[PDB]
Amino acid sequence: SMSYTWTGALITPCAAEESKLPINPLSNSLLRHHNMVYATTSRSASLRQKKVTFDRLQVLDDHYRDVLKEMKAKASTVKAKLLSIEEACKLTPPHSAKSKFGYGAKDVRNLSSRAVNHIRSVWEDLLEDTETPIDTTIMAKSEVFCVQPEGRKPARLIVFPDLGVRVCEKMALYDVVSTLPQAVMGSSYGFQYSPKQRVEFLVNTWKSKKCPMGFSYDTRCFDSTVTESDIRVEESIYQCCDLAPEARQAIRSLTERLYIGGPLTNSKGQNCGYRRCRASGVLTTSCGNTLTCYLKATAACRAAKLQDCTMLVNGDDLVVICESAGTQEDAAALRAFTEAMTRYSAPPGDPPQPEYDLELITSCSSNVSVAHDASGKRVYYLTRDPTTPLARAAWETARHTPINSWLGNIIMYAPTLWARMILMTHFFSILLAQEQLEKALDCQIYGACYSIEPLDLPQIIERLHGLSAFTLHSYSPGEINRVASCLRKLGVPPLRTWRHRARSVRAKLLSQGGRAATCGRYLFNWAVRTKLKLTPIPAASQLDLSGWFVAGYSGGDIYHS
Numbered sequence: 001s002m003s004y005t006w007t008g009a010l011i012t013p014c015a016a017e018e019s020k021l022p023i024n025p026l027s028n029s030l031l032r033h034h035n036m037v038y039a040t041t042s043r044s045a046s047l048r049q050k051k052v053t054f055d056r057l058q059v060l061d062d063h064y065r066d067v068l069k070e071m072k073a074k075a076s077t078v079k080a081k082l083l084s085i086e087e088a089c090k091l092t093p094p095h096s097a098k099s100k101f102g103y104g105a106k107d108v109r110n111l112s113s114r115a116v117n118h119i120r121s122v123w124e125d126l127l128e129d130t131e132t133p134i135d136t137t138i139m140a141k142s143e144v145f146c147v148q149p150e151g152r153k154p155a156r157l158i159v160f161p162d163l164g165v166r167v168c169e170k171m172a173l174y175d176v177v178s179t180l181p182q183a184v185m186g187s188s189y190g191f192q193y194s195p196k197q198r199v200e201f202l203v204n205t206w207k208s209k210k211c212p213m214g215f216s217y218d219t220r221c222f223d224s225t226v227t228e229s230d231i232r233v234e235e236s237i238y239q240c241c242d243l244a245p246e247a248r249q250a251i252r253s254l255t256e257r258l259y260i261g262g263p264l265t266n267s268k269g270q271n272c273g274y275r276r277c278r279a280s281g282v283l284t285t286s287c288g289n290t291l292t293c294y295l296k297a298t299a300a301c302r303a304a305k306l307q308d309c310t311m312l313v314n315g316d317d318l319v320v321i322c323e324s325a326g327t328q329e330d331a332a333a334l335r336a337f338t339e340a341m342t343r344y345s346a347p348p349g350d351p352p353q354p355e356y357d358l359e360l361i362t363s364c365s366s367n368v369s370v371a372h373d374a375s376g377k378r379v380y381y382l383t384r385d386p387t388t389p390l391a392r393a394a395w396e397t398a399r400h401t402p403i404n405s406w407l408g409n410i411i412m413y414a415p416t417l418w419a420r421m422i423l424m425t426h427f428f429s430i431l432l433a434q435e436q437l438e439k440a441l442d443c444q445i446y447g448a449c450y451s452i453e454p455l456d457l458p459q460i461i462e463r464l465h466g467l468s469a470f471t472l473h474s475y476s477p478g479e480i481n482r483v484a485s486c487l488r489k490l491g492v493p494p495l496r497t498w499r500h501r502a503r504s505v506r507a508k509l510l511s512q513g514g515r516a517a518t519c520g521r522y523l524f525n526w527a528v529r530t531k532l533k534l535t536p537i538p539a540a541s542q543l544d545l546s547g548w549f550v551a552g553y554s555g556g557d558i559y560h561s
């Protein structure tokens, strides 16, 4: 069976799509090579459609079944609650795609009599109807990138059900999908970790091995490799939770009717094809992908007889650290592993490379690098090639986009050379210039959408990274060469120029006192020679990030207000 069948109807946009970076005074001071920056559109959808459509091979074995039972054993631990319509709506992001049935996200959030009635009827139909496939829209996602060294990416696709359904998924599954991965995978579940916690875990795992070997594994179009069996097995795990009767039935109907496959419709309302694999835009895609990657990966480790495997799983991204048996025997073990995964229907994009320095391993586009704090002590932190973040920064500088990936990157990659000298300097300079310092902004962390105030960045950074994040220096030469190389490529002024801009911006922040001066002091301490003494922020210890690093939610339509 094929991941997709198509009718021949086009994947259509519903608004004019922009694709080239505008020529803007502001984004041009960040990034001069504007023709290198682009956004994907509907126009490239048929290339993706080809790429994402293939037949699937899946043969299961005892290792797989053994691991499944063990996962289910842990699942059986879990009790899960139905959300009320109220809670479910409050998790709806304000600009979520409006229902086809005469109400939108703002009406859902207000608990408008119309929206809520529609939701209740959707819910009842979920209890009453087991079999009727639920409709989904398919859309070309618009993401921005930098052009490949030699050529472009075609748009990614997003498959989502009507708003009314999305709300009913939250009611049935929000507590499950955000409690159960932890219960099952334990320390292997990556979305439980803040940035410093992920680092502690990777370094500690690495340091705990007599002789560590590690690799990342990258299955191509993970979503299209997920089969109906996979999605049903994923359901068998959810059914181990203590569930209210209505949620048990709702998950069962949602599984047959939605998760397992269904019909696709384009913005024009046209039958477009049929999906027989994971939908990218539902509440369970993050969790399901995590359980599924975990289940197969664990089974494959056993298949390859890898020793003392520790893995970290976040949706489809997967990293394994384990005991090196020797170069030859590690190389042969990885290939065995890959062929095991391939049989479970998770073949690799590129074959995994056994790796013997932690810094060389890369997952979620990020690697571990070293720097030194104030005392000179070695500090590990997560970083990445900054090209895509930077190109997106230029884009978002020239366009009011609904999500500010620049804000997210500052939060997630705060200790990096490039986030501190470029993102902060650029964006605080702009925001100062436009009186926008106190204006809250949307970004998303691990899928979930958050409204954040720029002036709160120093406390958030403290909590997510520690004080260390404000004092790192003596980055690794390879990291500096990567960042420097990247700027030449993109036409971003050199780091030397950003220090000069930072010094200026820092002054202006200190001028303003209060929360703005806090930013100047902590965020830009790197910019001045006569550094200020930096101590814990009172407001950081205090305030509240309960929902931040609990679970993955990408595609799930989640907003934490």
Ligand SMILES: CC(=O)N1c2ccccc2NC2=C(C(=O)CC(C)(C)C2)[C@@H]1c1ccc(OCc2ccccc2)c(Cl)c1
Pocket: 190, 191, 194, 195, 198, 314, 317, 363, 364, 365, 366, 382, 383, 405, 406, 408, 409, 412, 413, 444, 445, 446, 447, 554
């Ligand atoms: C699709 C998605 O939501 N993620 C994602 C996955 C894969 C590639 C690139 C990404 N992009 C981003 C993620 C964010 O949250 C926000 C940010 C604007 C950054 C972009 C998130 C992510 C990024 C890194 C991740 O691990 C590494 C890591 C973790 C913590 C601190 C630093 C680094 C994990 Cl698990 C998820």
